[PDB]
């Protein structure tokens, strides 16, 4: 289900980073990945993901995308919490 939404297969390309387009999807993939016991790998992607997110907020902040930014922080927050609980 998630592979179809992501656009590509992370499962095949283990070395590559996860795609950031449609972030709510990407986030769902990692927390799926964690339940599937690739939990050292999930954690590593999650650290990468949040660095992308906080830069994706910072670099893309104009006055226009305030609704997008508000959803992007609500996401980052839920990422950060998982990070903690996983660590």
């Amino acid at each position: 289900t998630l592979v179809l939404l992501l656009g590509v297969d992370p499962s095949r390309q283990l070395d590559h980073p996860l795609p950031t387009v449609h972030p709510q999807v990407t986030y769902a993939y990692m927390k799926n990945m964690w339940k599937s016991a690739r939990k050292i790998d999930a954690f590593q992607h999650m650290q990468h993901f949040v660095q992308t997110m906080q830069q994706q907020a910072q670099h893309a902040i104009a006055t226009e995308d305030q609704q997008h930014k508000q959803e992007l922080h609500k996401l980052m927050a839920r990422c950060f919490l998982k990070l903690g609980e996983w660590q």
Side-chain angles (χ1 to χ4, degrees), residues 14-83:
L14 291 162
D15 298 316
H16 288 246
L18 302 177
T20 319
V21 290
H22 316 298
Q24 185 62 29
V25 181
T26 310
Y27 175 70
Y29 186 62
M30 291 128 95
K31 63 194 284 175
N32 176 49
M33 179 161 35
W34 178 274
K35 287 186 168 72
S36 313
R38 293 182 190 75
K39 39 174 65 167
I40 306 104
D41 204 341
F43 187 83
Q44 289 284 8
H45 284 295
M46 189 70 74
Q47 293 173 312
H48 274 285
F49 185 57
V50 177
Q51 288 177 49
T52 319
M53 285 286 103
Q54 72 195 359
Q55 289 176 20
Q56 196 168 65
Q58 185 183 1
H59 293 101
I61 277 154
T63 322
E64 188 73 56
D65 279 29
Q66 68 181 311
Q67 291 189 327
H68 173 71
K69 186 187 81 83
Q70 190 171 17
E71 295 163 29
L72 202 74
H73 281 303
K74 278 190 179 75
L75 179 61
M76 269 177 65
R78 293 162 56 186
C79 298
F80 274 127
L81 212 86
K82 283 285 165 184
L83 258 165

